[PDB]
Amino acid sequence: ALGLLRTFDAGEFAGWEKVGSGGFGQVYKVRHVHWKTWLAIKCSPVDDRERMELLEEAKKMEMAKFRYILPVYGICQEPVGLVMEYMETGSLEKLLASEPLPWDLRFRIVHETAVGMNFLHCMSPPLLHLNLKPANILLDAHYHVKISDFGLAKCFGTIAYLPPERIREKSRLFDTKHDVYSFAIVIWGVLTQKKPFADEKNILHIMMKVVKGHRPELPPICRPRPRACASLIGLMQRCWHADPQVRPTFQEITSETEDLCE
Numbered sequence: 001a002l003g004l005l006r007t008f009d010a011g012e013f014a015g016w017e018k019v020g021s022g023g024f025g026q027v028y029k030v031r032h033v034h035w036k037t038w039l040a041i042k043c044s045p046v047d048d049r050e051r052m053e054l055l056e057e058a059k060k061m062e063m064a065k066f067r068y069i070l071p072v073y074g075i076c077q078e079p080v081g082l083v084m085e086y087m088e089t090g091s092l093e094k095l096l097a098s099e100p101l102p103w104d105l106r107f108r109i110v111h112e113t114a115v116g117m118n119f120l121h122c123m124s125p126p127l128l129h130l131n132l133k134p135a136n137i138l139l140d141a142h143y144h145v146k147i148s149d150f151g152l153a154k155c156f157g158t159i160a161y162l163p164p165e166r167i168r169e170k171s172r173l174f175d176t177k178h179d180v181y182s183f184a185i186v187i188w189g190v191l192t193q194k195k196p197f198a199d200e201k202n203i204l205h206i207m208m209k210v211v212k213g214h215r216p217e218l219p220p221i222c223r224p225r226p227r228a229c230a231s232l233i234g235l236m237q238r239c240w241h242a243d244p245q246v247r248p249t250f251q252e253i254t255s256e257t258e259d260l261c262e
C-alpha cells in the first residue's frame with residue numbers, strides 16, 4: 001500500500017502556483033523538472049498526527065487506483081505534502097459557475113462520477129468517500145471526471161451534502177448510503193448549475209427542515225433532453241430519500257446513468 005509511493009524533495013519541483021486553499025490548505029500546481037509534467041501538491045498548515053493522517057490519505061488513494069479516481073504519486077517532506085496528479089480544468093464547482101453546459105456532457109459527468117463511487121463501494125471492505133461534492137470532483141483537459149479529496153474517507157457549505165440521518169442521530173455509523181445522498185446533491189448541481197441552498201441564510205432552519213424531508217427545489221424539465229432530464233430528476237429524488245435503506249446502491253445508480261449517456 002505505502003511501498004510503491006515515492007518520497008519527493010522540494011528541489012524536484014519548480015514553478016509553484018497556488019490553485020486552492022482552506023482547511024487542508026495550500027494546494028499547488030508544480031512542475032516536476034525531471035519528469036517534465038505538472039503535478040499537484042497539497043501542503044500542511046507540523047506534528048506526527050498530520051504525518052500519519054496524510055500517509056493514510058495516500059494509502060487510501062493508492063488502494064483505489066482507478067480510471068475515475070485521482071492518482072497519487074507520493075509524499076513531499078520539505079514542506080510535508082501529498083503529491084498527486086494535476087487536473088488542468090479544475091473542479092466541477094468552477095465548471096458549473098462558468099457557463100451553460102451541453103446536456104450530453106452533464107450526463108457524462110454524472111455517469112463517470114457514479115462509476116467512480118461504485119468502484120469505491122465495490123472494494124472489500126467498501127471505501128466510503130464522505131466528502132463528495134462538485135468542489136472535490138476534478139476534471140481533466142477533456143472534461144472526464146476524477147474523484148478527489150480522500151481526507152475524510154473511511155475503511156459551512158458541506159451542510160447541503162450532509163445526509164439527514166447525520167443530523168437526526170448524534171454519532172451514527174457511516175455507510176454507503178451517506179455517499180449516495182451526497183451524490184443526489186451533486187446531481188442537483190449538475191441539473192441547475194447552482195449551489196444548493198445558496199439563497200437561504202438560516203442554516204439551522206433549513207437543516208431542521210431537511211430532517212423532515214425538505215430538499216433543494218426540483219428543477220423544471222429541460223427543453224433539449226426532456227426524457228433523460230426527467231429520468232435523472234427521478235434518480236436524484238431516490239438518492240436523497242429520507243430513509244437511507246430506500247436509496248439506491250451505486251450498482252443500481254450506474255445502470256441508470258449509463259442509459260442517460262445513450
Ligand SMILES: [Cl-]
Binds near residue numbers: 228
Ligand atoms: Cl431526451
